[PDB]
Amino acid sequence: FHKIRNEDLIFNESLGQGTFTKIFKGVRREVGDYGQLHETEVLLKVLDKAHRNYSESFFEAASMMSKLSHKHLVLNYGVCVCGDENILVQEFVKFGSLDTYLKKNKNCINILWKLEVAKQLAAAMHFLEENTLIHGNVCAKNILLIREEDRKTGNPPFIKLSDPGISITVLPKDILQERIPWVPPECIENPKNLNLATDKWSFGTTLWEICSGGDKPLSALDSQRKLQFYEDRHQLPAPKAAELANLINNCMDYEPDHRPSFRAIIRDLNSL
Ligand SMILES: O=C(Nc1nc2cccc(-c3ccc(CN4CCS(=O)(=O)CC4)cc3)n2n1)C1CC1
């Protein structure tokens, strides 16, 4: 990671919190191309001091996203580890997390918009699968909207996938259960089962979110009931807009070996 000075970072408004983290919009003062000085908008992710013992995993997650370069992956700019802080410095995506956007703009998102976003997410995941690189936390809140759809110019929306955060392989069990049905059944049974097939399952859950206007599946179930949901081998209900329900259920296969490749997922999406 590139090291960024604390004095070059300005923390501004809170964007909420993640698991053991707080997130802010900020500004990074930097020398850019041609030596020009810039004050660049950045996403600042801060590991809670009380959870400093996760620092390794915290940075490993981000390092995953910098292992490769791709148009659908959020950029890491660097880290600030001055003093008692563990800070990730990332690209700031103008329109933010997709679940919030879906909840706010549900009354004007149609099947074509959803198909474009689904195809872009699948393209990103196909890139990761070809590189045998596990993401491990695919979900709508980790999809960021770079550009809105502009039908006046035919321009489709454009999204990127953000870093997965601290890995489910080290998180407490109660958090994993709260993350049902994004965390697949085999990872509830054993978080060390994290594998490429994990991201196919979570991709299914994320499509469900995209089709459900930002609703969270199984939100009315407490952790014990989410566990039993897996134990009874239930599937998610079809969204009212049911165009992707079969793909959702095919990806959310309780047999990890049977989940379709992302190449096959993309072929399916292109057939609609
Ligand atoms: O937020 C914006 N851009 C932006 N860029 C990036 C780049 C990387 C990561 C993020 C990001 C920020 C926050 C979150 C969690 N978060 C908590 C409250 S929640 O309501 O559940 C919606 C999601 C998740 C991802 N972001 N976010 C624009 C709208 C102001």
Curated annotation (Swiss-Prot):
Changing K3L: In myeloproliferative disorder with erythrocytosis; requires 2 nucleotide substitutions. Autophosphorylated, leading to regulate its activity. Also phosphorylated by TEC. Phosphorylated on tyrosine residues in response to interferon gamma signaling. Phosphorylated on tyrosine residues in response to a signaling cascade that is activated by increased cellular retinol. The record marks D174, I175 as: Breakpoint for translocation to form PCM1-JAK2 fusion protein. It comes from the Eukaryota. The modification Phosphotyrosine is found at Y34. Ubiquitously expressed throughout most tissues. It is found in: Endomembrane system; Cytoplasm; Nucleus. Belongs to the protein kinase superfamily. Tyr protein kinase family. JAK subfamily. Interacts with EPOR, LYN, SIRPA, SH2B1 and TEC. Interacts with IL23R. Interacts with SKB1. Interacts with STAM2. Interacts with IFNGR2 (via intracellular domain). Interacts with LEPR (Isoform B). Interacts with HSP90AB1; promotes functional activation in a heat shock-dependent manner. Interacts with STRA6. Interacts with RHEX; this interaction occurs in a erythropoietin (EPO)-dependent manner. Interacts with ASB2; the interaction targets JAK2 for Notch-induced proteasomal degradation. Interacts with MPL/TPOR. This is Tyrosine-protein kinase JAK2. It comes from Homo sapiens (Human). The chain holds residues 537 to 808 of 1132 of the full protein.
